[PDB]
Amino acid sequence: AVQLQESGGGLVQPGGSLRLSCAASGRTFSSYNMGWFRQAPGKGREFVASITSSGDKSDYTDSVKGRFTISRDNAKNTMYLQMNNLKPEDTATYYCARGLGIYIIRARGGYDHWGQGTQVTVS
Amino acid sequence: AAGAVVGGLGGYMLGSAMSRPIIHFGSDYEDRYYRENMHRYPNQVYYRPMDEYSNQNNFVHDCVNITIKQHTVTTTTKGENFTETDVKMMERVVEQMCITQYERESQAY
């Protein structure tokens, strides 16, 4: 069973920068689309960004476009989320997930294999 | 609505066949192009339950993207070819039909 693990979370000042990582076990990382979601208390788990298997296309929720950058290193079984110009509204547990089907989508139903999450707190 | 699988993922809904809205593009020419070609564009949209999103824009983006992906696949096998203008026009009309669908889902809730 492929498992995913987030890291890189922490406490960061408004306007600051953090880079998250998602590491996958197994040997099929590059065969699947991947995504990042976030959940704050009192809210549900919501789309942040996604990237195709090859890296050829990416997608973002409107509130993070221009601030956050998703990428992947297919030779290292790792996805990243570079988060710049962080805002208080970005505070959440961030989860990585593996795409279902061949199309990257924004719906919560479009991914599985959720990690346990990494906490990001913007003062 | 009808349940659907697209691109190997289930959980989609396929809406009813709709009356496509007339779209304005800011030139009479493109308006008339649209009127002449709108039959080539979707009149049914693929969407997912509202509860799979935290906002309307994400619901509508998925609905636009997957509808036009599925339409492009199924119509290219029957010989269709879409130009850049066609794609732009499809994105606008499908976006309106997806917003209508979102409103229907949001009133039901």
Side-chain angles (χ1 to χ4, degrees):
Chain A
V2 169
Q3 298 175 291
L4 296 185
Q5 189 57 77
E6 307 87 339
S7 68
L11 178 66
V12 55
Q13 52 193 344
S17 274
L18 274 179
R19 189 194 194 61
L20 308 185
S21 289
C22 169
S25 70
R27 293 169 286 159
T28 63
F29 180 73
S30 71
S31 298
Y32 295 84
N33 303 329
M34 297 284 300
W36 289 98
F37 288 62
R38 67 188 176 180
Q39 183 179 7
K43 281 173 78 61
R45 196 169 295 195
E46 74 187 8
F47 183 74
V48 173
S50 63
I51 187 161
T52 57
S53 69
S54 69
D56 69 353
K57 291 205 170 64
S58 55
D59 185 39
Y60 301 86
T61 202
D62 285 351
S63 70
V64 309
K65 208 189 156 51
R67 302 190 299 114
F68 290 12
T69 309
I70 195 177
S71 62
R72 63 197 299 158
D73 186 342
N74 280 334
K76 292 188 165 192
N77 265 37
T78 303
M79 171 177 64
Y80 307 94
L81 190 70
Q82 182 61 44
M83 305 192 282
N84 291 339
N85 197 25
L86 284 161
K87 300 172 179 288
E89 82 202 52
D90 296 316
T91 294
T93 297
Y94 283 71
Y95 293 98
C96 63
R98 194 169 82 175
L100 289 164
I102 63 174
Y103 305 128
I104 51 173
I105 66 168
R106 305 191 179 164
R108 166 77 192 67
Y111 300 84
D112 63 4
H113 286 77
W114 310 92
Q116 290 297 107
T118 190
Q119 182 60 38
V120 171
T121 302
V122 186
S123 327
Chain B
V5 173
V6 178
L9 169 60
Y12 288 99
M13 306 300 321
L14 179 59
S16 297
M18 304 305 280
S19 182
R20 301 185 191 82
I22 288 304
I23 302 292
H24 296 284
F25 296 85
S27 97
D28 293 343
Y29 180 86
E30 284 194 298
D31 293 356
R32 165 164 66 88
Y33 183 94
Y34 178 83
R35 291 190 305 269
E36 293 179 3
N37 286 276
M38 59 198 288
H39 69 279
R40 297 166 63 219
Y41 299 160
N43 62 6
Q44 280 190 269
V45 306
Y46 292 87
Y47 64 100
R48 301 186 65 86
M50 215 191 130
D51 70 20
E52 300 205 7
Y53 306 94
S54 68
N55 63 65
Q56 171 186 332
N57 281 355
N58 288 172
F59 173 103
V60 169
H61 192 267
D62 278 357
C63 173
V64 174
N65 175 38
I66 298 297
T67 300
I68 288 168
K69 281 169 157 60
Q70 189 49 242
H71 185 68
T72 298
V73 171
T74 64
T75 65
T76 46
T77 79
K78 302 173 205 202
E80 183 54 281
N81 173 75
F82 293 130
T83 65
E84 185 139 18
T85 297
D86 294 318
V87 174
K88 170 265 272 267
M89 290 191 170
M90 284 188 292
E91 281 170 355
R92 296 272 304 271
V93 61
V94 175
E95 180 183 40
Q96 282 308 306
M97 294 181 295
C98 292
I99 293 165
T100 295
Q101 190 66 45
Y102 180 83
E103 291 171 353
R104 288 175 196 192
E105 300 311 292
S106 176
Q107 291 164 338
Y109 170 89

